[PDB]
């Protein structure tokens, strides 16, 4: 029984990492949300066509104190906003904008010192089930491009200090752990050869089929 | 023996295994057509010789321009069609091999170029093979399909490929065919002119060897048939 | 109020866990679900399914559709070797790439069967006759005709029959013996012989191929999942 | 005291929760429901009501009551076209400021039908007959009244019917094609033209004008909520 | 089921933004409850001309070090106040004024580091629905300016720090959020056209219907 | 939401408690049970046989 498909594919795994600091005013992190980011996680998704699945994601944030210039730098406890974009929202460019303030963009606020903050996201696509490999070009388009399948968006994910700081510089890290829940999966596949070159498409170098051996006798 | 669809007509052998999908026969749920869209569209017939590598068949799109379904699919293009494809190719007692007869769901295809995408007149020719090449495709090209037999153009091992619903055809023992895929699909009713939502791949495992005076090809013909089609209209 | 007591381990993120947790869209509605033919339930599933087993590497035919076929002719040697490859596991063994022995990376302990169906795709004239023989774990390879086939083996009548089945077992864990040391003498073998040579007719070729085929006889027992090696 | 655990994602603000709260004012006595005549149950009810759709924007009549007038005449050419709009959502048609673009603006997916009542605000004595045509999705914009009329179409007598009904459906996806290009073809027309004439009797005047309304014919499905682009 | 009255009203909206500094002795904040403060919120409103709702706010309050003189700012935790005036209340002036302790204003207290303070106000009105629109003189006076309807009076809102300082300064933020509840709707209304200019009345400039095109074929 | 109120020794980590914990793996299957001979339940059965005593000591 751990041979099923929960127990195979309901785990956890860091798949992003990026540092964001408060005073650069170019600050902000940005994750579009796929599976194609980690190789590990990729290659267990890619052994079947079809899927459906809730997810679950929790942060880990941390903070380290700049170097500032001088005099008793002091500081309170810091505030994090980490904002969902659904599929065909509106998208932030800089710190200060609009598009942090709407309504149906929702953000979890979420001061230091306390547990993680975990959400949790449903199935979220118009159609009814997620596609890992799609042959044909982007429908629903003027121009298309192969391969795309613009049905299966996720969302992105947005994240900034709603703290202003004047005394000292502070820089952040976050994980983003990632975690499928009640999986179902369809028309099994076989299970990728060659290296994984880039993350967009399915194009690679061809390689030999196995290791070799001195003889067959 | 002797089955016929609208006018035409083919013939099959009464003790023949057919293996059917992945275990469910093609269904309805629409205008559903009968009229002249379930008729065997036979395609034309490719020659396997020695130095053969093999062959690949884009499905929704090799019967775009064969008949009324070919202009069905202009004037109606939403629509979720079952199939039904019969290959029997016919060689003598005294020629030998193997062929592998899959039907690959969503064959996404790679490119020689790592950093662009394939064209659409080198991924289906209309009712023309697109055949591989035994050796590797290099990256001067700017948008041609990788078609490396042993990685199947997909990236992947193609000794693993039997996990498709798959036929062997041993010229010793077997000599036809015969594969029935339902409608495999997300969502209910698709676009037709941005999908291609089956593959159909013969691909020569043993080569063709003979005698000298034999004859030195072997014809191999493909029948497709659409059955249990309709349209959003 | 009521009066609650926080135990040890209670601010912590556990990345094993299994707790409710607030649904960030709620009153969405989303699509129900819709019968896709082929669902898996189990990853035994991909197991049962039979793959091509790579026997022929030989250091060049790897890139090659040459790597799935064992090649077989008609010589002047009474009784010589078709083929035999080891069952130690792991190690760069043939069933390694399979649609087997991909699943069997992703894991610890396993223990099952084997099936191996072999496939004779030459004339349909060419008759002969082949001995497929399995030593056991502890019984070195052996290394003429008559003492393979004293041990296990199934006799193989090609002009009868174009496929023949063996089941072997295959273990995770090999038994070693403390004093005789050699890379793989407590794996198995299963090694196959030239019974009798290869009569064909006039115009007929000799020189044929066989296939060979690898599944799961019954089922599996694997424990304790892990990530593959068959990445960066 | 009694043993609890925090989970993570405990002390947080997710701005799409529900949970209970501390009231900010307890024993107030709040003043009872009254019978208001009116009560909207459900955004699909504004939608059901039909409004007038400006179909002659003609870049000076749009601040204007001219905008929402066709005009009609009676010219000395044997067949031509009244009006044309294409069905196109959200790229500046006609259909997106009136009572439904306004709601469904407001969501990202929705899929139903339309309702298109005409009536003709013309004299009491006058008398003609127009074609209504509508151009599925594919088929381009017809150029002739004869392949205008071999498509779908209802024939409107205008001495004898002085409203006529056009259903037409209307989705938030166009399914494009590959090869051939154009701003709208796979979204439909619903163009009209000149059968007859318009033959009047003296002391009346021939310049006559229509109005153009649009509905929602059956239930909508609307899904993911958003905010609309008619603001700064 | 998504077009319902309560699934298009009940969602978040950040509808104010004040900073108050603990030593300037003008530093506090101050709010007047009403809908018309954002322009994507009040457009919603206004499709109904009465309206009957529960509400439900919830404060995000931060802080940020100022820069004091020398000699180790150091600093505890702060804690804030944030009062309700009820309609018909008294109003405070100064930061240091009687109507801050007063008992029918009903303030919360609330550290940094804890989660956010949500309270709840009930339907507070003498009539029974709300009217976003009101043709009318102000009733119940003795001089009357138009369209203002006193009796959709909601309360008042004001904050500030109950923590004395002397060593650092400490200017704070506030995010005040906004969230309609068991919301019941009479007498739609066809949606805004123009631009809003004003808050308090619904003047306007004259727009086109439409957006134009080249023809009408 | 609910209404609690935490008592004293409340973060706190006595060595002698019995509280339940999160389970670092689950969906294991760890290995059955097997009868293996001479269980023992209690210490009082290590001191029920009976052993040599060393009467003699005497230095060496």
């Known amino acids: 029984s751990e041979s099923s498909i929960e127990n195979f594919l309901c785990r956890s795994a860091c798949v992003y990492y990026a540092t964001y600091t408060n005073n650069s005013k170019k600050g902000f992190a940005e994750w579009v949300i796929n599976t194609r980011q980690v190789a590990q996680l990729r290659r267990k998704l890619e052994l079947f066509t079809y899927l459906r699945f809730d997810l679950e994601l929790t942060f880990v944030i941390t903070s380290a104190q700049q170097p500032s210039t001088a005099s008793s730098v002091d500081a309170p406890v810091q505030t994090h906003q980490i904002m969902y974009v659904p599929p065909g929202g509106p998208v932030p460019t800089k710190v200060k904008d609009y598009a942090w303030q709407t309504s149906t963009n929702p953000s979890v606020f979420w001061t230091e010192g306390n547990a993680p903050p975990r959400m949790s996201i449903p199935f979220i696509s118009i159609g009814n089930a997620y596609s890992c490999f799609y042959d044909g070009w982007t429908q629903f388009s003027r121009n298309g491009v192969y391969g795309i399948n613009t049905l299966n968006n996720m969302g992105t994910l947005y994240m900034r200090h709603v703290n202003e700081a004047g005394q000292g510089p502070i820089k952040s890290t976050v994980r983003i752990y990632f975690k499928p829940k009640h999986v179902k999966a369809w028309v099994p596949r076989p299970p990728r050869l060659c290296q994984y070159e880039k993350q967009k498409n399915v194009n690679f170098s061809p390689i030999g089929v196995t290791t070799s051996r001195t003889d067959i006798i | 023996r002797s089955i016929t669809l609208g006018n035409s007509t083919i013939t099959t052998q009464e003790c023949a295994n057919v293996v059917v999908g992945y275990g469910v026969w093609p269904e309805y749920l629409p205008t559903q057509p009968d009229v002249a869209t379930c008729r065997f569209y036979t395609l034309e017939s490719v020659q396997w010789m020695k130095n053969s590598a093999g062959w690949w068949w884009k499905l929704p799109d090799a019967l775009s321009q064969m008949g009324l379904f070919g202009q069905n699919m202009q004037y109606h293009y939403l629509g979720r069609t079952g199939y039904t494809i019969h290959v029997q190719c016919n060689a003598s007692k005294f020629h030998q091999g193997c062929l592998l007869v899959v039907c690959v769901p969503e064959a996404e295809m790679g490119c020689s170029n790592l950093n662009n995408t394939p064209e659409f007149s080198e991924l289906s020719g209309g009712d023309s093979a697109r055949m591989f090449t035994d050796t590797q495709v290099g990256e001067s090209n700017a948008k041609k399909v990788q078609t490396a037999v042993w990685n199947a153009g997909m990236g992947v091992g193609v000794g693993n490929l039997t996990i498709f619903p798959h036929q062997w055809i041993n010229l010793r023992t077997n000599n036809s065919a015969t594969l029935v895929m339902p409608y495999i699909n997300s969502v209910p009713m698709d676009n037709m002119f941005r999908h291609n939502n089956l593959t159909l791949m013969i691909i020569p495992f043993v080569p063709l060897n003979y005698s000298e005076g034999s004859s030195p090809y072997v014809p191999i013909t493909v029948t497709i048939a659409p059955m249990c089609a309709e349209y959003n209209g | ?232």
């Open chain 3, 1 to 232: 109020g009521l009066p609650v007591m926080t135990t040890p381990g209670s601010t912590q993120f556990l990345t094993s866990d299994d707790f409710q947790s607030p649904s960030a869209m709620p009153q969405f509605d989303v699509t129900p679900e819709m019968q896709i033919p082929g669902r898996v339930n189990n990853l035994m599933e991909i197991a049962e399914v039979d793959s091509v087993v790579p026997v022929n590497n030989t250091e060049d035919n790897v890139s090659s559709l040459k790597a799935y076929q064992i090649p077989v002719q008609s010589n002047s040697d009474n009784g010589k070797q078709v083929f035999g490859f080891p069952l130690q596991p792991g190690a760069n063994n043939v069933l390694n790439r399979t649609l087997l022995g991909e699943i069997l990376n992703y894991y610890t302990h396993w223990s099952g069967s084997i099936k191996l169906t072999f496939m004779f795709c030459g004339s349909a004239m060419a008759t002969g006759k082949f001995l497929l023989a399995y030593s056991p774990p502890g019984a070195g390879v052996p290394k003429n005709r008559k003492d393979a086939m004293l041990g296990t083996h199934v006799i193989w009548d090609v002009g009868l029959q174009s496929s023949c089945v063996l089941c072997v077992p295959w273990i995770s864990q090999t038994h070693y013996r403390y004093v005789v040391e050699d890379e793989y003498t407590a794996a198995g073998y299963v090694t196959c012989w030239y019974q009798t040579n290869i009569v064909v007719p006039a115009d007929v070729q000799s020189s044929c191929d066989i296939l060979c085929f690898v599944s799961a006889c019954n089922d599996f027992s694997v424990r304790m999942l892990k990530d593959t090696p068959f990445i960066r």
